[PDB]
Symmetry: C2
Subunit: 300 residues, 2 copies
């Protein structure tokens, strides 16, 4: 049983991952928080609360970030939570029961970590700024962090950031706040990294969307399919979440690394023999991965 | 029983309209066709075919337009069909049975109208260019048109078109092809207009979305809700109201006004009331409760 604190930024994948983490027997979410990076805050807060009401177990709260980004995501990607938050499945109950936490995400994270006895695993599928902030303000939290699992970075020649001022070598979660990645990388914590590359072997395919639609009878599968209709014809965050729940889906190669913090290469992650250790996921088992998440969806 | 030929441009409310027409006991769809105006053609074609498969009755075909627009819709509005087409409810069967018609939409329209013995009601919820074109090639078709019900136009000082080269006075279905509107306007046909204003009394509201979500148990209500999630609160059901007026004329009133359309320059697509113009029957004073009760009744029939 792993105690997990989950900070996400409200894309379809972040929200799908919330849904799946809640079906893992092996995981207990101590807290959820939302950062307005790849989302607008209000729909992502709401959708998270409704998913926990609908598909959750214990009583938990969702905290809102008041972090601000250096390099904001494209407005069009950010809209997706409005759609998820509007799905009938998530509105059928006509009530939102799970509470917004009183404290902002970074303070919520601090308070949750320090109030849990056991060390907790941090799962971040958006930028790292709520964590950089928690560290800056209360670095004793190092002692409560088992490890950080983060969707971010790439060690290919080019990333997924194609934006003015940028050289095109960074990945989005890092580019959104390179200074936060730097701070996290100075902290004394173990870091498992799901990079852009890490997901090579599990592309979300039309044959996989169509197999899901065939099993729409399962309400969790129907829900998965409504979520991915919004981004129609890689599951970065889902893979990250799934690696927390089932480490054996993939392998990990320890590399030494730095993050660039300014100029046209800001956000870029670079392997250096001088840098700090980072355990980079590779070699995802296709069949096991997709069998795992459809198993989990069917538990509802 | 009304014979209806339906031309739509594959926005969310076009596709929702198709689904609801199909539940109306007093309507028999003789033909459906898709124009790539507020949609990309492929997802709109597929979505229409899958809707007819899952929720339709008799065997019909969907024709693809090869009409082109003068003033294209914004890209981001046009994507919405991709999402509806990808919804699991519509992909559960794993096959698409209803056929694409062999002819393009304007030709399809002509052949359908002339092959059906009684007159047919034309229902257009996108631009008018498949009809303009039908009329240009085969004006005999006036003889088979009971009337046109069209979502288009506005008689307010401003419309919903906010685009370069335009003065902001037109509505989108007219603006997409103003020449087509002019051609239809010159035809000897009766025209019922659902304008932008027509819908004032029936905003889609959060309270209505939520009340639909509560009855998700009905698969057609759940389907309606999925469709409207795509266009969520951050809205007026213009096309759905147009389609409902065909099924239940008694939901609204109509005022006959004489009208022209501007065809060129910064005011292109503008509809203007003139004592000299041609008669158009403009919908107003929609009964809120009956309208929304009607479409929720229709959704529950599946
Ligand atoms: O670059 C990958 C990330 O970008 C954005 C997604 O929500 C994801 O976590
Ligand atoms: O101008 C309103 C129209 O624009 C778009 C909708 O599909 C509707 O018919
Ligand atoms: Ca994310
Ligand atoms: Ca339309």
């Amino acid at each position: 049983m792993k105690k997990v604190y989950f900070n996400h930024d409200g894309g379809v994948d972040d929200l799908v991952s919330l849904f799946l983490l809640l079906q893992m027997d092996n995981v207990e979410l101590t807290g959820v928080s939302v950062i307005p990076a790849d989302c607008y805050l209000e729909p992502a807060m709401s959708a998270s609360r409704k998913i926990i009401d609908r598909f959750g177990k214990n009583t938990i709260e969702v905290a809102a970030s008041n972090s601000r980004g250096k390099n904001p995501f494209p407005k069009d990607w950010r809209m997706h939570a409005f759609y998820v938050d509007a799905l009938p499945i998530l509105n059928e109950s006509g009530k939102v029961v799970t509470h917004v936490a009183a404290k902002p995400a970074h303070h919520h994270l601090i308070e949750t970590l320090l109030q849990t006895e056991e060390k907790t695993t941090l799962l971040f599928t958006g930028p790292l700024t709520d964590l950089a902030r928690a560290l800056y303000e209360a670095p004793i939290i190092e002692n409560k962090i088992k490890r950080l699992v983060w969707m971010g970075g790439t060690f290919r020649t080019a990333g997924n950031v194609h934006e003015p001022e940028h050289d095109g070598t960074a990945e989005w979660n890092s580019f959104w706040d390179p200074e936060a990645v730097a701070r996290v990388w100075e902290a004394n914590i173990e870091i498992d990294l799901i990079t852009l590359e890490s997901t090579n072997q599990v592309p979300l395919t039309i044959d996989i969307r169509e197999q899901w639609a065939k099993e729409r009878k399962y309400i969790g599968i129907d829900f998965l399919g409504q979520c991915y209709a919004i981004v129609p014809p890689y599951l970065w965050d889902v893979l990250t979440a799934a690696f927390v729940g089932k480490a054996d889906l993939a392998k990990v190669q320890t590399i030494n690394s730095i993050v660039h913090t300014y100029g046209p290469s800001q956000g870029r992650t670079v392997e250096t023999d001088d840098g700090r250790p980072v355990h980079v996921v590779y070699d995802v088992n296709h069949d096991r991965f997709f069998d795992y998440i459809t198993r989990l969806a069917k538990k509802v």
